[PDB]
């Protein structure tokens, strides 16, 4: 899947200044682009606009060369796998949440394999009816990290053309979490991936790194080229 922002400006409802200004961003099919910058710089806004929680003020977002606003909502949800705290949950079983409410389109074994590959099966097993426990209402509320791993499992299961990855819980070390990064690394390979970077070390391998400051893209390049550029990214290379 191809994703392109053309002269995109966006302002959160009620705000008086834009969150994004004249964003031009091309992510060709199969490439990974890492967005870096301070929290509140607009990097998360860029990724989240693809989900159409809001519409842009001006400009164009194109998906496979078609404006986002031309897709039916069903087609939009099918194209994009969101791995973030805003992954959409259903008042339904865990298995049905991993399957994105698509029933009898996946097998039980596929759902279970996706759960294990996301390292979600450990906490799922502690629920009374396992994968078939009803989450949400009159049921279990997911912790934040549990919700992320449900999102990883859903993304692993669906094999979607577009991945939006918010690398939350940058504090990572142990075994089940080290292999989470390994699972994410394989998922973003062979897929158009927009990654919200929260630790710089995790995105040195992106095909292009994009530095956002105050809603403006200030620098673009590979990790090595950006270091030789001795600009903003090179200065941010002080957190290591």
């Amino acid at each position, epitope marked *: 899947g191809d994703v392109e922002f053309r002269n995109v400006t966006f302002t959160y409802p009620g705000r008086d200044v834009p969150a994004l200004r004249n964003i031009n961003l091309k992510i060709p099919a199969g490439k990974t682009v890492a967005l870096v910058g301070r929290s509140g710089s607009g990097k998360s806004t860029i990724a989240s606009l693809i989900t159409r929680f809001y519409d842009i003020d001006e400009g164009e977002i194109l998906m496979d060369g078609h404006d986002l606003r031309e897709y039916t909502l069903a087609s939009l949800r099918n194209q994009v796998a969101l791995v973030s705290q805003n992954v959409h949950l259903f008042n339904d079983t865990v298995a049905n949440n991993i399957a994105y409410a698509r029933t009898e389109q996946y097998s039980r074994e596929q759902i279970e394999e996706a759960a294990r590959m996301a390292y979600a099966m450990d906490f799922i097993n502690k629920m009374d009816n396992g994968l078939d426990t009803v989450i949400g209402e009159n049921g279990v509320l997911l912790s934040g990290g549990q919700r992320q791993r449900i999102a990883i499992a859903r993304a692993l299961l669906r094999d979607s053309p577009i991945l939006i990855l918010d690398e939350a819980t940058s504090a990572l070390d142990t075994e089940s979490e080290r292999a989470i990064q390994a699972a994410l690394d394989e998922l973003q390979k062979n897929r158009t991936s927009l990654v919200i970077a929260h630790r710089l070390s995790t995105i040195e391998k992106a095909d292009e790194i994009v530095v956002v400051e*105050d809603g403006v893209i200030v620098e673009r390049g590979t990790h090595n080229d950006l270091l030789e550029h001795r600009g*903003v990214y090179a200065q941010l290379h002080k957190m290591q």
Partner: nanobody
Amino acid sequence: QMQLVESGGGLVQAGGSLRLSCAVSGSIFSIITLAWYRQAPGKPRENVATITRGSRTSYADSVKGRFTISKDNAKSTVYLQMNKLKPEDTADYYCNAEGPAGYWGQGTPVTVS
């Protein structure tokens, strides 16, 4: 569409000085990173000097103490003051905006005899 237009290049003898200019239209000039790169006939295109939002500057080691990058928000122009020019500075000099995968001028030639 963004345009970067260099000027000021030419022929100078060793020890001479040259000031390059680059007019930038279509950019959020005060915020994006600006830079000068250069490329000699056999070598790849390499960074010379870089200036970020607050006019914070950086330089390649071979150029420190001789070259100076600066920017003018009012004129939306970026400049490269080249003093104490060495023959090894002979190259095509390129203006750049938004980093090495960003936008590029078409260069201005510099020859140091």
